[PDB]
Design a protein around this ligand. Structure first.
Ligand SMILES: CCCCCCCCCCCCCCCCCC(=O)OC[C@H](COP(=O)([O-])OCC(O)COP(=O)([O-])OC[C@@H](COC(=O)CCCCCCCCCCCCCCCCC)OC(=O)CCCCCCCCCCCCCCCCC)OC(=O)CCCCCCCCCCCCCCCCC
Ligand SMILES: CCCCCCCCCCCCCCCCCC(=O)OC[C@H](COP(=O)([O-])OCC(O)COP(=O)([O-])OC[C@@H](COC(=O)CCCCCCCCCCCCCCCCC)OC(=O)CCCCCCCCCCCCCCCCC)OC(=O)CCCCCCCCCCCCCCCCC
Ligand SMILES: CCCCCCCCCCCCCCCCCC(=O)OC[C@H](COP(=O)([O-])OCC(O)COP(=O)([O-])OC[C@@H](COC(=O)CCCCCCCCCCCCCCCCC)OC(=O)CCCCCCCCCCCCCCCCC)OC(=O)CCCCCCCCCCCCCCCCC
Ligand code: HEC
Ligand code: HEC
Ligand code: HEM
Ligand code: HEM
Ligand code: HEM
Ligand code: HEM
Ligand SMILES: COc1cc2[nH]c(C)c(-c3ccc(Oc4ccc(OC(F)(F)F)cc4)cc3)c(=O)c2cc1Cl
Ligand SMILES: COc1cc2[nH]c(C)c(-c3ccc(Oc4ccc(OC(F)(F)F)cc4)cc3)c(=O)c2cc1Cl
Ligand SMILES: [Mg+2]
Ligand SMILES: [Mg+2]
Lengths: 360, 243, 88, 243, 88, 360
């Protein structure tokens, strides 16, 4: 396999005008590696038994040498997984990368859904108040689908049997993801990568050493920022209620999931209908997938350069980004008629921008 | 409902990157817990051995543990008995179960305080403000017995009576006692008890983040070393211009 | 998931010794409250004015919790600026 | 030491591939456990609901459960209380802990009998022989009080007194009682209690092993179908011999 | 890990009714033991002979456990052949 | 990957005189598959907590629908894993397959050690008397190596922490084995398989359909015998003491491991020295590995045909097989001076036969 290693990581030729916007695929991969290493290590001392799960995490931190380091690194790195993915996807929408890298885009979307499901499974394991009540709610939005809920839990409620099986699935899915990363890379190197200017060019150079040293430089920043946050606690990435034991007969005063799920949780909150809110979920994913066939949606021949430079009409991806930020604020607020009004305003922009990306 | 008010920022020593816990104040806050708060609140995750070499010396911790009666067994005859405490025992709990706790506090349950500063928004600043926020009710609000008005508690109506009052215990180091002093001290103790590994964590981070930063500079130089050979390259079409 | 979150640019104060050790047997909040009560006077008046409007209504409805909460929050924030100067 | 003797093979109905448990005898063995063995032995894995529709009908099981006093709680005041039993309760245990059991049996612990026929070599045959193996000691062997001689127990010296004697209980179906009858019945009950899923397991296996066998025959024919075209093939060198 | 292990070629017997129902109030092992005791007589004599050799020794050593165990094992195996014929 | 599938499982050519002695590699592979399927299913309801492990297995059998089937299939199939491997290895020693299939032999030996370790980890999980006391003993034979014991357990005795980590390792190792099976097949198809007569030949035919139907026929017998034993219990493959809860202060009257570990456990029992018994363990593995270089140990050119047919001097592999059977009987017996004498007699044959296989 060493001829494959040198063909794809040493002698592979790349355009000279690459920059840091093309380095975040490597960073995501490295976050998976770090999670697998720290995750397996945590598994040696975790207990899936509901009556003792919450206690096994605390005892791990308070009694075991270096136990605090593996627990806090696993929690912090999870946040960096989703930040890197977000920047990774936004580059593609800025450069219309899916125009000719079609199966790379689709394979990526599957990886995104796999990572969402993995993170949701992991957040239930510590078995605090937010673990229990967040799983109860998010698993009810899927109620319109018949009998899709009572079986995944194996009971009449998020009981102790659900926790045992969420542990096994959480263990397994990341390694399946590693298989799909191989397909992702297959579809990319089939066509070759694009560049920031959106042109064909013969001014290319080998990956090693020029481009390999840019990936290495970015890795340093990632490791330093993870350890900075992990060891000092500068930002508030976790909710305090998950430091409280589960109580099935007392709901917390404010239920909100992790930040990387907040925006779409707000969209589903401002739509009163429960069935209409789930249809909105499918339409959004369908729109992202349809971009793989953007060449065929109009007979005019497209170009990769979108001309956002010095342009006062901006671009649709930029307008989406600010609508997402606006909804993260709404999702973190107490329900109030005024918040609901503006939340619906932003939801329209959040959805319309996706649809018009298929037009040109 | 509405969003509760954000508590003010008090200058606790530990809030800086380069700072440790204030141990003299942690010691005094442990006297406050033992003589006031422990009557209604448990700290089930803490053990006497946790205090040795970090807050109090060993011989002093033994004397404190032995002043309690702890249940142990079963004996050879299959019965239970009591004995004085030892370093391996947990902090004693005032009630056997949650139902007994509510019965003695008018139906309200005093929560366990083992992770209390990690279990509330704003943490120690909230606890400091709470302890000094009891006021008389405003015009138009009448509360039934067992409830009290507090500036910072969500909803304003709390079931805990005011726990602190000026002059009630005598510190061992001679520090004069008052409501504000006891509040600052008990907060420091409970912040330490929420995570005793905080000082080890911060000192290791300083060594690590500084090392990584230096390596980041070196890798930047190594990258620009290779960037310059293609950024200064000349390519001519047709004929050679300059050497 | 942390006991506290570290902060930048915190001013750590210097302890002010008293004259008689017996002076600090009373809460030193009493010395700072009068001055802090005068600086929040904009809310002292909104509260006193809302009491009159409620005392005059015929029905038994109305309260002053809103104005009362804002007033005492202003004072607590003024006290926090200096309270630790008098605590060991 | 030496290898203990192998017990004899008794013709229990369940020993055949095609056979089920003998339920009339399982019923009588449950009376023997309740009135003799339960005084010293627990069966902590069994619950009253396990008997319904498989050994006894529902209304009869309720009457048996209600004849016991079971501890439950805590109540609203954080106290414990007692109540009659229900289908959801476990078989009652005679002692609270192991230390109390030994104290009442001269230091010997009567083991739990929830998996007893799976926890000894030769299983039910051993239990049948044990129960009828008490004899007087041989010449030269003197045992101290609390020990008894048994043919089949390893070492011969056992601390259980002879539990059965002729005429001691009255079966409900009218079967005359004697030591040998009670032994056969109590063994059947304890074999069922070791695994109540035995009948479901055996009936599913008959359907499966028969199907798989038939498919094995069909695959044998399909293999020989292709074997014959190369086993009957002719290859000639130089010139063609036969067509 | 199994409650029992199934066997091949087991002879399941037919029940022999009694004459008077009160007859089976005594253990039916008594009827079969005499006949089974005569067929194991080769061990009845080895046991009686070992008792004499032990009764004659001067010191207080020796026993007959070995011969005793073989004798009663022979009898139990003879009874098992037919005991279930008289049990419901 | 479909061109690899058809190249190696459809059009691959094989000698016409193959028979059932060449079908047991496929059967072993299928046993791994069955174990992975049933193992993962058991993991959904197993508890590694020592105080509740033993109870979680019983509750699984007594309360859960079809719980008895997955528990008994996993236990029975493990025995068939080792029987197939034994027949698989014996064919190689009968035909001197390692003469030219050198790296296939070595890779196989690594797979054998991986399977031994996996089975040992799994037998401790149910947490009965034999689980605890068998791990305590087998982990003391490794005492001569310094500090190789107190760390694998993470305590002063086979405590509750050892059980948590044996669960994770047991989960992981089988999938590593699946990786090494790929190498095993790489080294085999590099040279091509041998045949029962030991000759080169051009009378070969394609794998599909002729040879594929023989593998299928054998699979039927395997599935039928596994279900026969699993659902009726004809043989005694497990020890009764493991149906008893752990007691740290009461040793059982007779400690013996599973049958597939008995023979070498007997060898180590008749050698009084503890350090000399472990050296005997290394020498045996070293002998098996050295057979990969049998061509070089003598200048005479070897042949694959060993001429056991109608030969009154038999062959060394046959003599080994009967010495192994003889020791399984000794290992299952109570210690007695007479048993020890004959056990040493057989141990000499057990070891000498291995050494003389390197001579010709
Ligand atoms: C001394 C005293 C103290 C002071 C000193 C300082 C002290 C502090 C310490 C020292 C600090 C400095 C040390 C030296 C640093 C040297 C290195 C350096 O300069 O680095 C810059 C350097 C820039 O790269 P480059 O190759 O030079 O140029 C790339 C081009 O810019 C790419 O451009 P392109 O044209 O090729 O590609 C087109 C497009 C392609 O797209 C992309 O590349 C991807 C998308 C880029 C945009 C990102 C935003 C979208 C994502 C939103 C995320 C939302 C978060 C959700 C949570 C919200 C919570 C509320 O990209 C863009 O459009 C990029 C331009 C974006 C401009 C954004 C403008 C913002 C305007 C804001 C207006 C606000 C108005 C209101 C004001 C109100 C108040 C008045 O980046 C690196 O070297 C990266 C190293 C680190 C790797 C990342 C590891 C950490 C991951 C977390 C952070 C993620 C963001 C990281 C940046 C990403 C850039 C793409
Ligand atoms: C008429 C009305 C009009 C109104 C208009 C209004 C609007 C105005 C326009 C729009 C403006 C906004 C536009 C959007 C913004 C972005 C625009 C943009 O693209 O800018 C281009 C601008 C230039 O791009 P570039 O030239 O390509 O350089 C970027 C390369 O990637 C750099 O490549 P490199 O990475 O290879 O670095 C090369 C260079 C270094 O390059 C630089 O340093 C350049 C940085 C920018 C310098 C800016 C200087 C400005 C002052 C004037 C110029 C100076 C005098 C020059 C004299 C020249 C004489 C010949 O290396 C060296 O020189 C040797 C090694 C030293 C570097 C290594 C430093 C390591 C530090 C420790 C690392 C620790 C790891 C993390 C551990 C955890 C945390 C501690 O890029 C930036 O400046 C981006 C900066 C990104 C910083 C990210 C991190 C921030 C962290 C903040 C922490 C919190 C601080 C809070 C404050 C208080 C602290 C105490
Ligand atoms: C109707 C009323 C009732 C009655 C009817 C019956 C009722 C019952 C049901 C119906 C039963 C019959 C149904 C029809 C059956 C049709 C199929 C059939 O005939 O099958 C035979 C057929 C024979 O294959 P073939 O292609 O015709 O010929 C191959 C040549 O024989 C290969 O020869 P080669 O020359 O090509 O290769 C050379 C060498 C290459 O080496 C190998 O192939 C490998 C090694 C082979 C030897 C195996 C033994 C070594 C392993 C020992 C294992 C120890 C276990 C540890 C535990 C011990 C516990 C104490 O192999 C040999 O040397 C093989 C010859 C071995 C002869 C053994 C002689 C034993 C003598 C014993 C003397 C005893 C003296 C004392 C007596 C005391 C009392 C007086 O095999 C199959 O079709 C296999 C189907 C099943 C697959 C296996 C799945 C189950 C796995 C467990 C069983 C493992 C053993 C299975 C046999 C392995 C054979 C290699
Ligand atoms: C019995 C007289 C108590 C004493 C003494 C102390 N506390 Fe307590 N506490 C008590 C009750 C009944 C409650 C519940 C209040 C309610 O309305 O539910 C509490 C609550 C707390 C809390 C939680 C506040 C929150 O935001 O939920 C804290 C942080 C707390 N109490 C701290 C505390 C301290 C520091 C004490 C010693 C100074 C103390 N309590 C004493 C009952 C009683
Ligand atoms: C108290 C008077 C008991 C009664 C009534 C019964 N059993 Fe018991 N049993 C008792 C003791 C003290 C012991 C330990 C014996 C020893 O020497 O350790 C036992 C043991 C058993 C066993 C285990 C035998 C073995 O091989 O370990 C069994 C299978 C058993 N007892 C069964 C049993 C039955 C069926 C009873 C009712 C007929 C019964 N026991 C009653 C104490 C007492
Ligand atoms: C585990 C998750 C992922 C990993 C490990 C990963 C990895 C990578 C890597 C290493 C590259 C090449 C370097 C780079 O351009 O950054 C790349 C490119 C690319 N990825 Fe990802 N990716 C992931 C998720 C995604 C997602 C979610 C999408 C889109 C929905 C996506 C779409 C693309 C595209 C279109 C490219 C080519 C960009 C171009 O050349 O213009 N990937 N990916
Ligand atoms: C992309 C990969 C992964 C992601 C995004 C992820 C995410 C998470 C998250 C968010 C938590 C909850 C943290 C908390 O709030 O306490 C968690 C916990 C956990 N994860 Fe992971 N995980 C990943 C991989 C793995 C793997 C591969 C394993 C094991 C093989 C693992 C084992 C665990 C365990 C045991 C816990 C419970 C401990 C705890 O909650 O701190 N994780 N994971
Ligand atoms: C070649 C592969 C495997 C072998 C040889 C093997 C062997 C064993 C053995 C011998 C036991 C003890 C059975 C008993 O006596 O109760 C066991 C138990 C267990 N194994 Fe496996 N195993 C394999 C694969 C796996 C895998 C891949 C998993 C999970 C991913 C797994 C999960 C379990 C569990 C949860 C138990 C405990 C349940 C029990 O003891 O019945 N096994 N295994
Ligand atoms: C998981 C364990 C194993 C698997 C799945 C496996 C699989 C296979 C398969 C499918 C074949 C080809 C078909 C056959 O000849 O049966 C084969 C051949 C072979 N295997 Fe294995 N094997 C395993 C273990 C071993 C071991 C333990 C050894 C020796 C120590 C070994 C040595 C060989 C050799 C020498 C051959 C070639 C035989 C010849 O062509 O003469 N393998 N293996
Ligand atoms: C134009 O540029 C973009 C458009 C984008 N559009 C969409 C629709 C998404 C997206 C996909 C899946 C997803 O998964 C979900 C998880 C959780 C849920 O539910 C709940 F409640 F939040 F947990 C719902 C859903 C959440 C969000 C993006 O990431 C996205 C990113 C960029 Cl850059
Ligand atoms: C000539 O033909 C043959 C020679 C053979 N020689 C040897 C030495 C082995 C062998 C290898 C490793 C092994 O692993 C061990 C597990 C457990 C232990 O220890 C204990 F106590 F058993 F658990 C020791 C060891 C056990 C046995 C064979 O299989 C083998 C097979 C054939 Cl056909
Ligand atoms: Mg087009
Ligand atoms: Mg040679």
């Amino acid at each position: 396999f060493m001829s494959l290693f040198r063909a794809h990581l040493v002698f592979y030729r790349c355009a000279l005008n690459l920059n840091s916007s093309y380095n975040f695929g490597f960073l995501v991969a490295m976050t998976f590696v770090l999670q697998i290493i720290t995750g397996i290590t945590l598994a040696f001392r975790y207990t899936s038994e509901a009556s003792c799960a919450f206690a096994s995490v605390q005892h791990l931190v308070r009694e075991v040498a270096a136990g605090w380091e593996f627990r806090m690194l696993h929690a912090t790195t999870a946040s960096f997984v989703f930040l890197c993915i977000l920047i990774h996807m936004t580059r593609g929408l800025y450069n219309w990368s899916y125009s000719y890298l079609t199966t790379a885009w689709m394979s990526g979307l599957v990886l995104y859904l796999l990572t969402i499901a993995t993170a949701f499974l992991g957040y239930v394991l510590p078995w605090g108040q937010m673990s229990f009540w967040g799983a109860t709610v998010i698993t009810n939005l899927l109620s319109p689908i018949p009998y899709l809920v009572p079986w995944l839990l194996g009971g009449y409620y998020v009981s102790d049997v659900t926790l045992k099986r969420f542990f096994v699935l959480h263990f397994i899915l990341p390694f399946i993801g590693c298989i799909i990363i191989v397909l992702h890379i297959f579809y990319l190197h089939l066509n070759g990568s694009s560049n920031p200017a959106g042109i064909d060019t013969a001014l290319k150079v080998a990956f090693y050493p020029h481009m390999l040293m840019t990936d290495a430089k970015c890795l340093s920043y990632l490791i330093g920022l993870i350890f900075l946050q992990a060891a000092f606690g500068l930002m508030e990435l976790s909710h305090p209620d998950n430091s409280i034991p589960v109580n099935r007969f007392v709901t917390p005063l404010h239920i909100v999931p992790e930040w990387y799920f907040l925006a779409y949780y707000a969209v589903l909150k401002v739509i009163p209908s429960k069935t209409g809110g789930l249809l909105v979920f499918m339409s959004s994913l369908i729109n992202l997938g349809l971009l793989s066939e953007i060449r065929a949606l109009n007979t005019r021949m497209l170009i990769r350069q979108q001309f956002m430079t010095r342009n006062v009409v901006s671009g649709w991806v930029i307008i989406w980004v600010y609508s997402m930020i606006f909804l993260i604020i709404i999702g973190s607020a107490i329900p109030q008629a005024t918040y609901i009004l503006y939340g619906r305003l932003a939801t329209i922009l959040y959805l319309t921008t996706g649809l018009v990306l298929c037009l040109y | 409902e509405k969003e509760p008010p954000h508590p003010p920022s008090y200058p606790f020593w530990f809030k800086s990157l380069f700072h440790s816990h204030d141990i003299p104040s942690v010691r005094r806050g442990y006297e406050v817990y033992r003589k006031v708060c422990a009557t209604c609140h448990s700290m089930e995750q803490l053990h006497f051995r946790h205090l040795v070499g970090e807050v109090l010396p060993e011989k002093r911790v033994k004397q404190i543990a032995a002043e309690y009666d702890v249940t142990d067994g079963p004996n050879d005859q299959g019965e239970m008995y009591t004995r004085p405490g030892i370093l391996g025992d947990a902090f004693p709990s005032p009630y056997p179960n949650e139902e007994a706790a509510r019965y003695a506090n008018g139906g309200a349950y005093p929560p366990d305080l083992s992770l209390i500063t990690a279990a509330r928004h704003f943490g120690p600043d909230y606890l400091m403000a709470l302890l000094g926020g009891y006021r008389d009710p405003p015009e138009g609000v009448e509360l039934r017995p067992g409830l009290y008005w507090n500036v910072w508690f969500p909803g304003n109506a709390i079931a805990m009576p005011p726990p602190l009052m000026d002059e009630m215990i005598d510190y061992e180091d001679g520090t004069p006692c008052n409501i504000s002093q006891m509040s600052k001290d008990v907060v420091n103790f409970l912040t330490w008890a929420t995570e005793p590994t905080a000082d080890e964590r911060k000192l290791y981070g300083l060594k690590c983040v500084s090392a990584i930063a230096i390596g980041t500079v070196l890798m930047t130089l190594w990258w620009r070393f290779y960037w310059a050979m293609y950024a200064t390259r000349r390519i001519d079409f047709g004929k050679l211009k300059y050497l | 998931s942390y006991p506290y979150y570290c902060e930048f640019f915190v001013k750590f104060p210097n302890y002010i010794p008293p004259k008689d050790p017996a002076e600090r047997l009373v809460d030193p909040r009493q010395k700072l409250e009068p001055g802090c009560t005068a600086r929040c006077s904009l809310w002292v008046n909104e509260y006193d004015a809302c009491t009159k409007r409620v005392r005059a209504r015929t029905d038994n409805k109305g309260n002053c919790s809103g104005q009362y909460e804002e007033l005492h929050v202003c004072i607590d924030r003024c006290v926090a600026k200096d309270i630790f100067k008098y605590l060991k």
